[PDB]
Amino acid sequence: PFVRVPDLFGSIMSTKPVVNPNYFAAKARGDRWIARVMNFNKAVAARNSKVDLCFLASMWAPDAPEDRLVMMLDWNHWVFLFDDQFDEGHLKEDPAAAAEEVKQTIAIMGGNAPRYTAESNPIRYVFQQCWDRLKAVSSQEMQQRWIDQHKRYFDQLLVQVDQQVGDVEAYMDLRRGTIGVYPAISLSEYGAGVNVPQHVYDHPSLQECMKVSADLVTLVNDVLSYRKDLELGVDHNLMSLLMQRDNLSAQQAVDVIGDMVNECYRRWYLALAELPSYGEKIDYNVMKFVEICRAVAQGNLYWSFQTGRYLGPEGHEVHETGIMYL
Amino acid sequence: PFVRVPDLFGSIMSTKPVVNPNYFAAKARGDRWIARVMNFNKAVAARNSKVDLCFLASMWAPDAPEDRLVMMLDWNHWVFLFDDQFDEGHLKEDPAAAAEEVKQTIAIMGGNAPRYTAESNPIRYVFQQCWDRLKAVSSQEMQQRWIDQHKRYFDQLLVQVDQQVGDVEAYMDLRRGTIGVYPAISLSEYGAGVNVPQHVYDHPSLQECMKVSADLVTLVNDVLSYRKDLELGVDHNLMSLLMQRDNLSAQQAVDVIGDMVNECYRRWYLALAELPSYGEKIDYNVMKFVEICRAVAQGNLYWSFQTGRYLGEGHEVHETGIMYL
Amino acid sequence: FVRVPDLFGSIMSTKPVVNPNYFAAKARGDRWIARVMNFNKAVAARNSKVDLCFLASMWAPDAPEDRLVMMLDWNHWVFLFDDQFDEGHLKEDPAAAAEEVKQTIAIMGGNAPRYTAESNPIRYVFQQCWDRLKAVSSQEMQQRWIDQHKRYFDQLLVQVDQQVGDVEAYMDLRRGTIGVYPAISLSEYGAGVNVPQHVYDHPSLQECMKVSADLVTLVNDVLSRKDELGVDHNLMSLLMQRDNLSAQQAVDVIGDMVNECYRRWYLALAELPSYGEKIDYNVMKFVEICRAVAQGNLYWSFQTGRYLGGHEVHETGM
Amino acid sequence: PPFVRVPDLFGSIMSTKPVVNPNYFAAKARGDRWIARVMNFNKAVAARNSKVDLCFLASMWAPDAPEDRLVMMLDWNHWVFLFDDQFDEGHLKEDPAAAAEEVKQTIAIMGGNAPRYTAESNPIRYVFQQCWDRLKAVSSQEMQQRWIDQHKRYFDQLLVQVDQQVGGENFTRDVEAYMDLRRGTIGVYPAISLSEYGAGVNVPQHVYDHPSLQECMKVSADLVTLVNDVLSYRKDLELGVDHNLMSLLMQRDNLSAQQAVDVIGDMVNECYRRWYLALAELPSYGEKIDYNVMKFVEICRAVAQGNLYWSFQTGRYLGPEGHEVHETGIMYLP
């Protein structure tokens, strides 16, 4: 059988995506570097290359210069390897060790961390290398924003571990953090050279744009991963949550996710309506920040279909037809 | 003395404007063509070139191919020459003749119009040349759109005449039509090759986006033309209406216009919040249409400053906000 | 080791422009060829990693998406087709190699049947490319495509005879066998460039195509350490035998040949007459196509580990 | 004759579609009103300068100069234009001592003992100083010296021009001598230095001085001279000028106007031949240097292609109708 999936390419997702022309040069530099850093064999490095996090980063900040794009690729490799420790690895059912990993990773960011090496701790090494470059070209305010957005991610990782070993709104709240879109937006502020002032960034409208970006990524992933989750019999996902809540069929559940996607767009514009002008000079950067929020979600969407992340090399037919066979 | 003009480059006006790369080639064609058609002397042709309607058109549809950008330039020359007849020229206080001009110009678009030549009626000739091009690459539906949006403009011209020979809301209502923003959006649909289906176009959100575009052009023009209006003693403008109605200083009135500009941005986003999705394929072109609405207003703004339309040194009013009087 | 010559000098030293439609075209064409050819998962993944889309995307960087997909289909075709003669069932079978060429030629306006993926997958792909080529190309450009493919098919048959059955003979065979000439035809389609035949046939432009083919041959020879496979039918071997040279000395002579290509390029262009602005505008685009086919092959060779697994060989110079 | 058929000036390396810097509009807005303020241009002279549109010219020389560097370029073009007129038609035209003193004081701006000028105290020198300040701030010593040396090549030829003007000898009849003085006074060599700054191109001196790259610069200068000679013929006739390539060729070989124009056409196409022959002799210096060499070669091409398109666009020689000369190849004569 099948479900008719919601069109995920509507409204602000419907425009032609722009990809960083430095994609090829950065992919060559960053895929081999992380392979060297992590001791990837020939197979693992090729699998990672296929995953192509460079494509994702290249849509988040399409005019980042090559060196910043490489840092963004390094960060995406970090996130991917870091996050795995909590979802599937040695921290998955260990709240005390998870909290300590978070504590030591935070300490990298201007705290009392040692100088790591690839050999002493390869994952923390990558994060430290990203932080060095971040802190070299960012104001103190920017540096603190990067710290604070990563802490929003780390905080929900710890909530997740507590739930692992130890409601749609509660699910979305958790995913908002764990999906990693908030620090991804900080990373893109760095790649694109955008520095919205903190008091403007803190406006509820811009905070809602970030929320919308994180929700769109969560919702798209929950749609596209359904076949895979069904194959491997998982339970911790929004489809299963909606089906179990009211005994919805898969089709009825996916339709509800379609409603939430379309409500993201409504929230987006209603937030922008409430966002005051701060004058041309600041507004110029506010619109670039708004574009970063959109591009993180649209990048996730195109990258998911491009790389066969959830639907294999033939998942593009889901895009064209709207049918996701099971 | 002076007034501090409100920032006109906030919000959706604050982005870096994209300009058609065909600007130079289209300008080299269309400027000397209109000078020939209109018999412009060397000095009048030079002034028209300065006015640089090509720059304006080049921001309305920045990826229009050269031949369509040319048409766009011809249309901009047409509408400036056409409109002058009603604002300042022989139709200004003649309702009967104004109605006949509209009737004859409407007949060009698939009606019973004769074939005009540059020698028989140069202004109608330009419009006919534009219509011929428009028809040749547009669906029947897009031809009728073009017709209907031009009629929204013509209708307010006839209203204006009646008043010429004869309320902020009524002021904005009339300007919305006479500013020519609605047919300019139809022109840009042609130039950019964007054909949103009529049932989507007619959605109130997209109609509100066009109205916001037209309001923005009206309000920007009223702000920037204040010094010129004071010099000439112009009295039928938004600044005089606001000062008269609410007993405001010039600074207080200019600031009210700035409030109205900012309310345009709020209306814009509130409209888009209500805009339904029609699926990716249509939505792709809807977003291009929305950008056309934005670009027509941003084009007017940058063109006003670039060409010294109202202020000559006007870039310093941009930088400081100070409009000396 | 050998210090390989700098292959990124002169007209190869510019920053490469890659078609922005790369991602969309790769998504369509890679899965399409896997289905046509019944690739298993591992073979399809290997093919995507080979990334012929990147190659095509540098040949014609402003091709629209549909044309780029056409170019990607063609590149998969030539890769599969050429392997039938270099290692497949036609490698030492002149009678069958001649029959394959005949049936492939017949696709291009001849008596060929309507192929399907089921009856003959490789012939089906080539037939799908020819249909698209013929739909948007003048009769003159159609004939040029046919004729450049025959310069390719001919050297294939010569190659098979030298299997069953002089640097200049080596280069002349390679020029025909590498496929640079039909790739230039493909790029004329992708880019929408239609130089008149009498200008195309001028010796200067023919030399520009010859220079492009030689550059591709020479870069392949240099990059292909792989030849730890025991092979001997290559340029390095021919130069070490003939002149009693070490590998380093031989590699250095190939670098001299590469730099001689660039001198030939400019000497050819010095002789190219003007046909007026209108035509010259498209001639300059055709010259860029010739340059881009060679530059595309160079960057693709390095980007995909095709020969070296290599971006360090680029930076440090094997 | 009532007309001549002019050669196709848009062939070969001039046939490409020119790329124009997207910062054109913002740079022009800044630079035109700045120069008008520096030079106290009245309303009409400022509008005339805007029309002349040296920004369009600079925007084709270095089409991806960032806005601030394009602004400098525009400033320099305005400087050159006003500076050069002093020697061609102004107060230095027949004054070898004043001309030498101006050159000395302008050379002193470039790291010598010049004072800090203001728009009030010497506006033309002030502009050159503001340009030099920005040039030096982002250029190595070697590139500073190259800019100085190329400006000195232009200044030297200006001094030769003034010496010839007061010496009262007959207009030359030696094409070689004609072309050599024009190459020097046209200002193409310092324009290439400016574009090396506008485009951030840094060819090392030993490569720059290779005869192939010097010939690319020479071809660029010759093309600008030859295009100017063809396009200005009508206005030269109108104004009665006799010191130009058309008259030299007609006098020397007893040619009609059409035959003389045809020879200039031959000279333009020989420029293209020389260009490629020079490139054939240019060595490779490895990827990193050759990358800059290819951009430098493009600068040489774009300075000449920019002159051609700008001349037509702005009506410099033929008015807004000169585009028809391009379209038809026919130039009508008074």
Known binding residues of A for Mg(2+) are 83, 221, 225
SS3 C1: coil
Under an 8 A CB cutoff, do A24 and C44 touch? no
Length, in residues, of chain C: 318
Token pair for A113: 């961390």
- Mutate one of A16, A29, A32, A70 to test the C interface: name it (highest C CB count within 10 A): A32
Contact B288, B3 (CB under 8 A): no
User: Does residue D111 sit at the B interface (CB-CB below 8 Å)?
Assistant: no
C-alpha span between B52 and B30 (Å, rounded): 10
C-alpha span between C153 and C148 (Å, rounded): 9
C-alpha span between A188 and A181 (Å, rounded): 10
Contact D282, D214 (CB under 8 A): no
Restricting to B residues 234-263, those with a Cβ less than 8 Å away from any Cβ of A are 262
C-alpha span between B262 and B260 (Å, rounded): 5
C-alpha span between A33 and A322 (Å, rounded): 38
Contacts of residue C254, Cβ cutoff 8 Å, sequence gap at least 6 = C5, C218, C221, C222, C235, C236, C239
- B286 CB neighbours in chain A (<8 A) are 14
C-alpha span between D300 and B164 (Å, rounded): 60
User: Does chain B touch chain C (at least 3 C-beta pairs within 8 Å)?
Assistant: no
CA distance D286 to chain C (A): 5
C-alpha span between D17 and D10 (Å, rounded): 10
Strands B322-324 and B2-4: antiparallel
- A290 CB neighbours in chain B (<8 A) are none
Q: Which of B14, B277, B280 sits opposite A284 (nearest CB)?
A: B14
Under an 8 A CB cutoff, do B35 and D320 touch? yes
D3-332 in CATH: which number? Answer: 1.10.600.10
- A269 CB neighbours in chain B (<8 A) are 269-270, 272-273, 275
Length, in residues, of chain A: 326
C-alpha span between D115 and D129 (Å, rounded): 10
Under an 8 A CB cutoff, do C23 and A306 touch? yes
Under an 8 A CB cutoff, do D8 and C259 touch? no
CA D123 to chain centre: 21
Contacts of residue A121, Cβ cutoff 8 Å, sequence gap at least 6 = none
- B304 CB neighbours in chain D (<8 A) are none
C-alpha span between A180 and A151 (Å, rounded): 10
**Alpha-helical segments (H) within chain C:** 22-36, 41-50, 52-59, 65-86, 94-106, 121-136, 139-164, 167-177, 180-191, 197-200, 203-223, 235-243, 247-271, 277-303, 311-316
CA distance B243 to chain A (A): 25
CA distance B294 to chain A (A): 14
C-alpha span between A69 and A61 (Å, rounded): 8
SS3 B4: strand
Under an 8 A CB cutoff, do B279 and A11 touch? no
Count of Cβ atoms closer than 10 Å to residue C72 Cβ:
26
Name the neighbours of C, counting chains with at least 3 Cβ pairs within 8 A: A, D
- CA-nearest residue to A284 within chain B is B14
Residue D203, by phi and psi: left (phi above 0), alpha (psi -120 to 50) or beta? beta
Restricting to C residues 258-317, those with a Cβ less than 8 Å away from any Cβ of D are 259, 262-263, 265-267, 269-270, 272, 274-277, 280-281, 283-284
Computed on alpha carbons and rounded to an integer, the radius of gyration of chain D in Å comes to: 20
Cα distance between the two ends of chain D = 9
- CA-nearest residue to D319 within chain B is B42
Q: Is D250 exposed, middle or buried (0-12, 13-18, 19+ CB in 10 A)?
A: middle
Cα D291 to Cα B75, C94, C256, C268, C315: the distances in Å are: 45, 46, 19, 22, 15
* All structural domains of chain C with their residue ranges: 10-316
- A12 CB neighbours in chain B (<8 A) are 287
CA distance B210 to chain A (A): 17
Under an 8 A CB cutoff, do C20 and A24 touch? no
Token pair for C102: 């005949």
User: Does residue C163 sit at the A interface (CB-CB below 8 Å)?
Assistant: no
Q: What angle do CA D58, D62, D64 make, to 5 degrees?
A: 120
CA distance D18 to chain C (A): 11
Under an 8 A CB cutoff, do C8 and D279 touch? no
- C272 CB neighbours in chain D (<8 A) are 12
Count of Cβ atoms closer than 10 Å to residue C316 Cβ:
9
Under an 8 A CB cutoff, do A269 and B273 touch? yes
C-alpha span between C179 and C83 (Å, rounded): 12
Q: Is C23 exposed, middle or buried (0-12, 13-18, 19+ CB in 10 A)?
A: buried
Strands A323-325 and A2-4: antiparallel
C-alpha span between A119 and C99 (Å, rounded): 60
CA B30 to chain centre: 18
Token pair for C185: 């035809």
- CA-nearest residue to A291 within chain B is B15
C-alpha span between A146 and A182 (Å, rounded): 9
Count of Cβ atoms closer than 10 Å to residue C245 Cβ:
15
D316 is in an annotated binding site: yes
C-alpha span between B51 and B35 (Å, rounded): 13
Smallest CA-to-CA distance from A12 within A223, A272, A203, A317 is with A272
C-alpha span between D33 and D41 (Å, rounded): 9
SS3 C40: coil
C-alpha span between B92 and B82 (Å, rounded): 12
- Mutate one of D16, D21, D32, D33 to test the B interface: name it (highest B CB count within 10 A): D33
Under an 8 A CB cutoff, do A313 and C49 touch? no
Contacts of residue B16, Cβ cutoff 8 Å, sequence gap at least 6 = A284
One-letter amino acid for residue B100 of the chain:
E
Under an 8 A CB cutoff, do D15 and C266 touch? no
Under an 8 A CB cutoff, do C276 and D8 touch? yes
Q: In sequence order, what are the beta bridge partners of A4? A: A323
- B266 CB neighbours in chain A (<8 A) are 273-274
Cα D125 to Cα B51, D88, D106, D284: the distances in Å are: 33, 17, 7, 40
Q: Three-state secondary structure along D191-210?
A: HHHHHHHHCCCCCCHHHHCC
Helix (H) or strand (E) holding A149: helix A140-165
Experimental method: X-ray
Smallest CA-to-CA distance from D314 within C275, B49, B283, A203 is with B49
Token pair for A251: 């089709």
Query: In CATH, what class is A2-325?
Result: mainly alpha
**A170 half-sphere exposure, CB direction, 13 A CA radius:** 7
SS3 D41: coil
CA distance A313 to chain C (A): 6
Count of Cβ atoms closer than 10 Å to residue D153 Cβ:
17
Q: In sequence order, what are the beta bridge partners of D332? A: D3
Cα D195 to Cα A251, D222, D299: the distances in Å are: 63, 18, 7
Q: What angle do CA D63, D64, D66 make, to 5 degrees?
A: 120
C-alpha span between C63 and A26 (Å, rounded): 24
Max Cα–Cα distance, chain C, nearest Å: 54
- D30 CB neighbours in chain B (<8 A) are 315
Under an 8 A CB cutoff, do D290 and C266 touch? no
- Mutate one of B269, B291, B298, B319 to test the A interface: name it (highest A CB count within 10 A): B269
Residue A277, by phi and psi: left (phi above 0), alpha (psi -120 to 50) or beta? beta
Contact B23, B59 (CB under 8 A): no
Contacts of residue D185, Cβ cutoff 8 Å, sequence gap at least 6 = D84, D154, D157, D158, D161
Q: Yes or no: is domain B2-324 CATH 1.10.600.10?
A: yes
SS3 D334: coil
Contact A145, A196 (CB under 8 A): no
C-alpha span between D55 and D71 (Å, rounded): 8
Token pair for A60: 């988040």
Query: In CATH, what class is C10-316?
Result: mainly alpha
Contact B68, B26 (CB under 8 A): no
Helix (H) or strand (E) holding B2: strand B2-4
Contact A323, A2 (CB under 8 A): yes
C-alpha span between A217 and A225 (Å, rounded): 12
- Mutate one of B9, B22, B32, B33 to test the D interface: name it (highest D CB count within 10 A): B32
Helix-, strand-, coil-residue percentages of chain D, each rounded to 5: 70, 0, 30
Smallest CA-to-CA distance from C190 within C55, C295, C26, C56 is with C56
Under an 8 A CB cutoff, do D51 and B46 touch? yes
C-alpha span between A225 and A247 (Å, rounded): 20
Under an 8 A CB cutoff, do D12 and C263 touch? no
Contact B226, B253 (CB under 8 A): no
C-alpha span between B311 and B316 (Å, rounded): 9
Tokens 């649209």 belong to residue: A298
Contact D322, D232 (CB under 8 A): no
